[PDB]
Design a protein around this ligand. Sequence first.
Ligand code: U2F
Ligand code: STL
Length: 440
Amino acid sequence: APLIVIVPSPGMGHLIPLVEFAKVLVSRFHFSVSLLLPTTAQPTKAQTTLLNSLPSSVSHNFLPTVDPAHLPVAHEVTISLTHAHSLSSIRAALGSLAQQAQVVALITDLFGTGLYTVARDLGIPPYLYFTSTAMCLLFLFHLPKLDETVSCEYRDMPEPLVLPGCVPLHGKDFVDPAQDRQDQAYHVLLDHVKRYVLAEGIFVNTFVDLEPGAIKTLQTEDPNVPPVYPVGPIIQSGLDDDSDCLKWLDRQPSGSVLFVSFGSGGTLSNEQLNELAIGLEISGHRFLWVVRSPPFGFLPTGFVDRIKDRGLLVPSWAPQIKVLSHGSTGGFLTHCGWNSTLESIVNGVPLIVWPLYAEQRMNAVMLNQGLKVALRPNASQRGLVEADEIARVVKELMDGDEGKKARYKMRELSDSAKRVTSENGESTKLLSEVASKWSQ
Ligand SMILES: O=c1ccn([C@@H]2O[C@H](COP(=O)(O)OP(=O)(O)O[C@H]3O[C@H](CO)[C@@H](O)[C@H](O)[C@H]3F)[C@@H](O)[C@H]2O)c(=O)[nH]1
Ligand SMILES: Oc1ccc(/C=C/c2cc(O)cc(O)c2)cc1
């Protein structure tokens, strides 16, 4: 069986999507997968749980530790230097796999582009698995031209960027590493983007119906850009441990529950949690809120008790796909991470977008002004979203006209998602087309 080698950037939001692509490759086709994981530290309990739960066709190997004493900032820079200081270990690992097996492809994420020429030299075609939007991919291919054209900090550009086929995008909403052009994170992002051109091909976790403009543009605007393969949505099945969540959702009316979840990495002040609480309470709507610390002793006096009839508080973790696919679930207050967004898209659940970091501000603008499947609260001057504003937008989503229009549009995207991933769907077919070229 041909071997595919996958090199994830260190960190769980890099590993989980590439593990998901791995599960897809080995279920749908006759391939084995070897994950080579560069690491700043010894395996986590979280990494070992995820990795030891995979089918036997997916092996894994933590590479020799890069000494964290010999890395003197932003996570983009740390990721990049981990890849660089692991180049030798990967070349060595890759050399040995290549002689003991037929290595037909290398797959990396958007920070593994240092491996592309290494893979080419060894007769292995390298692919980029882009875990965010086609719009975000287009933004990044355009960034070097933007960097020359515009000399001010992007937030100071009073006019929006209008990429062909895409919603206008103010500079304040550009990805995080583009918000300080003096930080090294900006320079590393440009270096990696400049090498996307070295990929045999770029998989994108999206589909034609979701982003027709950015995909049309990516696939026609430039010969310089490699082939681009929309093969999504690819999402976790959610058939794993856990949780009174489902028992509780069963007692609620159809489309009546607002699921509220900022991810693992999405951190809110105690002041902002307490405004969210009062806001949920005074909305009058039913909610399931994954409450992460700023058990519920820091929450507004009396709140836990006053919402016993209409809201469930869950510490730390909920079964997201099980919640989102339940008929009680009417909405999702999310930080707009792409994997959460895709889960919500395939289950027809419309959103309130509350972006926190990475490319989330760009996802919010796409979801809110482009696809019109999301509402958005307004922050006050200091950046705090006030209880009264949370209540207003919760009511708009769960019972208002804007919510009805969003729910309708999101149910249409839901139907496209099901179609494009079915036996004869555009996404199933395209990935089969690319994989079959490896099979020989
Ligand atoms: O209580 C919980 C909370 C989450 N989950 C699951 O964790 C995943 C969350 O993915 P999400 O894209 O929202 O966050 P993250 O992993 O940081 O994504 C990064 O990478 C993304 C691109 O790959 C990027 O768009 C994003 O901004 C980054 F953060 C998703 O599979 C949920 O079902 C859960 O099961 N229970
Ligand atoms: O620890 C980290 C975990 C995840 C990330 C992701 C960064 C990122 C930046 C982009 O411009 C686009 C994108 O899709 C992702 C960065 C650090």
